[PDB]
Amino acid sequence: MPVRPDLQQLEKCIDDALRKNDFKPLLALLQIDICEDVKIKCSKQFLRKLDDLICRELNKKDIQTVSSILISIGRCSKNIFILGQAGLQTMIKQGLVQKMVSWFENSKEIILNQDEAVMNMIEDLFDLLMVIYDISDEGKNQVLESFIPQICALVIDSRVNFCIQQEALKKMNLMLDRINQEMLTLMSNMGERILDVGDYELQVGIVEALCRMTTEKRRQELAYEWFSMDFIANAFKEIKDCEFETDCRIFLNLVNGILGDKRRVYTFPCLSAFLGKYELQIPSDEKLEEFWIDFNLGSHTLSFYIEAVTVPEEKVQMYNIEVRESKKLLTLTLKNIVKISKKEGKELLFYFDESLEITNVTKKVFGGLEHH
Length: 372
What we know:
372 residues, 5-stranded antiparallel beta sheet, 16 helices, Synaptonemal complex protein 2
């Protein structure tokens, strides 16, 4: 009795979505496990139909349906053939990367005026971008050339939700990992942006992007163009590629420290942290001077490494701060159980030295959530 979905019918599913506004066939395919045996025949006009359907759904603001299309293309990408030739490479030769630039451009109105459906949609878009990047040198060259400037512009734009910037910035650093007046301007605005982005994870990714795109030698001059403050330009020039992760912590702690009451990231050393009753493990390099906790005034999160852990303000039911035995305890009651390093709990406890200003910093990220 049940109708069986047929992967070989992918293009007809796209036709049904286009012509009938019926997404049930496409959705049914998403429940099949792709087998490396199967060959999906697609036409020379498949890319045009994809472009038509995605632009229409973007114009309608049907966020989750754009996601379903992008996921279908990626999941099936390595099983599609067009007139006998590899389907992904044929679409690349038909201009797929420039269609994806267009889809990203046509997503900008959505990206601005915003829930996490948009977050998933952009993640799905970049996931498809990475499949194209990894499939050949040509797809990789076009992706780098077109999307590095787009992502930098997105990361610099203070109107964009931090989770979208974090997703894009991390995909960009992945693309740079394997491997112009406009870039020089963008990179200068990226440096400026570190100073007030107000999110430690974005600060690191931007620093990381700038260091992947510029030599340690070049940064000796670019530091003084990118950072007006001599103190900050000096610290930047000391970041060594070979100890990047720990030197980047040192630099950012200096930058956020020197900015004083203008800083948008407050970093405190922490004595010990707990999820429920379980003590979380402190990262121990031989180089990280302290167990650091980052209070992110731009993104309204608290974040730290243990694995990065991020606590957004919408996840906090309430918190309190108490002084006992010469320690300041920040207790966060979360709105749901979370899992960190195979442990679970609903409350996060952070113990701080009593001289630290936990109360006034915490109310900048979790405003209106303190219980006395």
